[PDB]
Design a protein around this ligand. Structure first.
Ligand SMILES: O=P(O)(O)OC[C@@H](O)[C@@H](O)[C@H](O)[C@H](O)CO
Ligand SMILES: [Cl-]
Ligand SMILES: [Mg+2]
Ligand SMILES: [Mg+2]
Ligand SMILES: [Mg+2]
Lengths: 687, 679
């Protein structure tokens, strides 16, 4: 059962106009536009504000007092009604921000939901069908189906009885005075929502709960509905779209092959209506926007995950990049380390455009995910962004404000991804284009029978279906046709710094108070073994680490090495015991068929990786202190100094000079220090 | 690890030409046509038969021994051009095999004598490249087939021993290559009839790929009942299925069952018949349609759908010739007329040369199959004019009784028009919004120019249909009830996830008729006459629910004596019915109340219960009120005339297994209670 402020809720009855849809502000605009056409002068904003709550006859008499007795009010009101339906039917019903997010939460809480509207059955059903929120409601109760409408409680009492519920078991959402009176009298849990006019003190007294907007109620409802569990592989994305946009600054391997999945999952209730991703690869941009979608291939399960509602933009296009930082609620920075200084200029322009912007997508702060595989990545991005903001604004107060306004989150990613080559894409586009030609071969409308339709709307149906058929038939092939751009592994969880309220409900995210702990695991358990295995694979004489796993000695070494590190980390970080076991297998699985992962890239800068407080020597010092086996780690350290001397042409004198300095820095006994070196130097000589 | 005839299998290496695809037969023709228009003398069959599963470099060596780069160039160009026009000729059962081996956790690869450029082209086109971890080609291998280097390299790259891997091949050369590698060799006949030497080398042999699939499937697990919002399989098999009657059950239930299939693969195409032209044209215009599950506000998109006209003869013959399973989802009134269309289809299947058809009879009636088999025999004998050919057809195919519990409604024509009108205005506005691949990024200007023309026309074709990502076509409001109960017989049904096979279908069909359909029809009449248009809303009323609980009590008490062995299950079956009714808000009363006279027949869901309770002296007060409301509904709502209602009432009571005393009493008590409701 849903508990809302200590009250068991089994139902939810919504008002339509003002509560769910922003149709009152559209009526304002149409009435002004209609007046400008007929009488020549616009009806004042102040007049229309005064008309809210009054009847059509009262509003007419007020218009007569101000604009003369012979004012064509009924003509203006009729034209305004035509302009309203016309705008709604083509551009869609204006939905209050947060509604669909609320409805999904209430529906997934098992609530039986209804609509109690003053409107007529016909227009009411079209509006709900238009907005694609009709699916959420079990019954609709209308003003033409009750003897006494608002402020009489009959409409809310009827809606409740049709759902097999007492009123006091139902949440009742309303904006108007007469509506709230109707909801309150019936004995329901009244939720008053401000539309245009600030509510009077009498209304605020009646209402059980009050909110300035829908999103404020959504924030409060989030306290009573759960954050969903980590998504499983091949689990569907949410059907319902929210009104938020998100950004992926760098549509690269990790950006398109991982972050796209996390943002596509979102909170499990809804997902963003659009995902904007920046790339300089013109072929990638034009291809994704042509299909309207792309897909990620998970080799292990031969599963093609389709990422919908994508819109690719040029990284060099200013207006497109500023639109990302202006419209998006969350942005994921998926750039290389070499691109930070150059891209920081475009970030500064984006945030400064957001600072100057007078839009309601910009008034709320931005959540910034730093997706870089380097320690102190945040420090690097924040430093460069500071330099760029001063260079653009030339104002220290505005610069600091922007840096402190937005949330900058440090992240740790484990999933490995491979971006498809431009040649492989062209090959795919040629074959997929050939299927479209084959599909456009067989494409080259009769609505008979009485059915229950008039001959006017039977002719009109033929026009609709034929027009739809001509436009959709070419895109029928997309039912079973995916544009593959990424080959990724099965690793789901992303570790993010706790801070941003927008991350609290993201189900594929793991929030940590400090990123230090999981970075140390990522360093020692993942990168450390990856480096020590890459050194072994290279000396054994293999190009990729994938081919190397075919050798029994290499795979055995990899399995024994992850065992010694995680045994030690289990004592140091026992609170991450589950994370160690999960990451252990995730690494071994990804390593198996890593043919596209070269050993050179992983084996770079061996001496730096063999430092006392780094991804090798630190793991040994822990295992020695806690009396655990370190034979495979000590072998790994030996392969490091061996690789450096053989492949990088480093001196044997430099290797020992470095080694000794690192051992003296370790927190070990003078006896333990000597024994480690004596054993290690002997292993290197053999190789 | 998979156990295939008591052998631990870790991997599965495949041959491409003649084993996966039927390309060996095609290149046979292209090499001959190429030789005609270059050297003049066409290649001998003895040369080409030795070139089967042989590397192009090794094939050039054999050409020198008898007498190629220029020949094979134009032959390969002809081959891939045939693939661009007619598609890749995929061997039947391949996709079904590949998925089962993948989901078993086997490390799969390819070992083909063909080039990498040619191999990838076909593997991508066929869309089977995703199933393989590594591929081995004739390019990288030094000593090609029949040397085991190619099959050893494939096994080594998978990180396994050859003896742990299965090996599929068509040719004699590739079998020797696979055998010398020391792997579990499998042989599939393509062109060359296997020699005695080959049958000794091979561990297992099969005539075609589908024969191996059948032998593999007895080791592959059978997946369990699907959950509500569980996805359908991605990969498509080469099988077709039919739905005779695109109605509430056909389109709103059966389509989901056939879309789930075995969980490994899904039918390539689903054919559905209807005389509703709007539905037919709408589904074909969109390409897909969605089932709406109101309880969880979930829209389930059904894809690979083709809606056909029931009266159109060639399209209905198309269904009964290509379909592996057909579901008959028609009302009782349309059985006699449509039986002639079924006869034509089954006789058209007999004349042609495929497999034994699985025929599902979906009808809410006691002895439903008897009625179908009766009308089918009469129809077939009328056309065939032979008892020997008909009795063969009637015993060839599997005719299966079913029990469907799921409550589903078909969207009205007015509501479907309303949907199209609203969603057409969005399309119009989108066409106003819609209103050059630069930078040589590791490509030639010529490729970049050719890519521009592909992307331009692709966008031009797809851009109008970008709205379909969010925009679905809703045609059915359905409850969440998953499992369909079917009679045992057909081997196909044993592997279908959403199907539950039962023995005594007749017993549960009787309870289903009396306890579900009977109470459902009678509370729908009561609710309709009280002014309710929704079953869900009607069950909110305390008198409507009390009536349903009073009926349930009277029916069960009768069934408890007729079927004492099911007496322990009635309380759970009755409660399961009320759970479905209570929150059926989108299921109209009209739909449940339709054809009152049919449902008030002597051997049907109302009168049968009344007759049972009179014999055993049980209360039938509410059942009698239920019957009265049925005739009251027929006269008041459907307008049949009272004269016909009383003649039906009198006729049906005469057909009941009762004494003349009980007939007169029942007739007098019922006609009195009918007049009472009209006063
Ligand atoms: O299909 P009918 O007209 O024979 O009966 C109406 C309902 O009882 C029937 O459609 C049920 O909904 C169905 O049998 C599922 O319980
Ligand atoms: Cl929203
Ligand atoms: Mg209102
Ligand atoms: Mg929120
Ligand atoms: Mg072959």
């Amino acid at each position: 059962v849903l508990i809302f402020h200590g009250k068991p809720v089994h139902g939810a009855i919504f008002d339509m106009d003002g509560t769910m849809f922003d149709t009152e502000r559209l009526r304002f605009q149409t009435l002004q536009q209609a007046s400008q056409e007929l009488i020549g002068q616009e009806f004042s904003h102040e007049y229309l504000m005064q008309c809210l709550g009054l009847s059509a006859t009262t509003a007419e008499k007020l218009a007569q007092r101000l604009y003369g007795v012979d004012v064509p009010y009924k003509e203006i009101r009729k034209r305004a009604d035509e302009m309203e339906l016309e705008h709604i039917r083509k551009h869609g019903v204006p939905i209050k921000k947060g509604l669909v997010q609320v409805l999904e939460r209430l529906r997934k809480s098992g609530l039986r939901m209804a609509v109690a509207t003053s409107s007529r059955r016909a227009i009411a059903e079209e509006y709900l069908i238009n907005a694609n929120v009709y699916k959420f409601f079990d019954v609709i109760t209308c003003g033409d189906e009750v003897e006494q409408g608002k402020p009489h409680p009959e409409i809310f009492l009827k809606a409740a009885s049709q759902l097999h519920l007492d009123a006091n078991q139902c949440l009742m959402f309303e904006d108007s005075e007469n509506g709230l009176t109707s909801a309150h009298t019936s004995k329901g849990l009244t939720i008053l929502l401000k539309d245009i006019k600030e509510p009077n003190d009498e209304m605020l007294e009646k209402a059980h709960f009050y909110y300035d907007q829908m999103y404020d109620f959504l924030t409060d409802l989030d306290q009573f509905i759960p954050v969903m569990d980590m998504p499983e592989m091949q689990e569907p994305f949410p059907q319902s779209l929210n009104q938020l946009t998100v950004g992926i600054h760098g549509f690269g391997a990790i950006g398109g092959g991982y972050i796209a999945q996390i943002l596509s999952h979102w909170d499990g209730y809804t997902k963003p209506k659009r995902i904007i991703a920046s790339t300089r690869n013109s072929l990638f941009r034009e291809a994704v926007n042509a299909f309207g979608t792309y897909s990620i291939r998970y080799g292990q399960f031969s599963y093609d995950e389709r990422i919908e509602n994508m819109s690719i933009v040029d990284s060099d296009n200013e207006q497109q990049m500023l639109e990302m930082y202006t419209h998006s609620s969350l942005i994921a920075l998926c750039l290389p380390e070499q691109a930070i200084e150059s891209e920081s200029k475009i970030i500064a322009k984006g945030l400064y455009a957001r600072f100057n912007s007078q839009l309601e997508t910009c008034i709320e702060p931005l959540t910034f995910l730093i997706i870089l595989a380097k320690v102190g990545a945040k420090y690097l991005v924040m430093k460069h962004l500071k330099e760029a903001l001063l260079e653009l604004t030339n104002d220290e107060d505005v610069t600091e404000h922007i840096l402190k306004e937005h949330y900058f989150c440090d992240t740790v990613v484990n999933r490995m991804v491979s971006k498809l080559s431009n040649q492989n894409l062209y090959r795919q586009l040629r074959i997929k284009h050939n299927f479209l030609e084959q599909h456009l071969e067989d494409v080259e409308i009769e609505i008979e029978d009485c059915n229950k339709l008039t001959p006017d709307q039977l002719n009109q149906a033929s026009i609709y279906v034929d027009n739809m058929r001509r436009n959709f038939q070419p895109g029928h092939i997309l039912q079973s046709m995916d544009l593959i751009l990424f080959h990724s592994e099965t690793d789901m969880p992303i570790y993010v710094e706790k801070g941003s309220p927008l991350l609290e409900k993201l189900r594929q995210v793991v929030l940590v108070d400090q990123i230090t702990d999981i970075q140390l695991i990522k360093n020692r358990l993942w990168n450390g073994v990856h480096a020590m295995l890459a050194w072994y694979a290279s000396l054994m004489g293999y190009e990729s680490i994938g081919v190397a796993m075919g050798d029994h000695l290499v795979k055995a070494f990899a399995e024994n090495l992850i065992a010694e590190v995680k045994q030690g980390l289990a004592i140091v970080l026992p609170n991450y015991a589950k994370d160690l076991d999960r990451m252990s297998q995730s690494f071994l699985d990804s390593c198996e068929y890593a043919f596209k992962d070269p050993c050179q890239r992983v084996a770079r800068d061996p001496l730096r990786k063999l430092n006392h407080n780094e991804r090798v020597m630190a793991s040994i010092a822990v295992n020695i202190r806690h009396d655990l086996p370190y034979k495979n780690l000590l072998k790994g350290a030996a392969l490091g100094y061996a690789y450096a001397i053989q492949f990088l042409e480093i001196e044997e004198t430099k290797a020992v000079e470095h080694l000794q300095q690192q051992i003296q820095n370790l927190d070990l006994s003078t006896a333990q220090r000597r024994q480690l070196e004596a054993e290690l130097v002997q292993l290197i000589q053999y190789l």
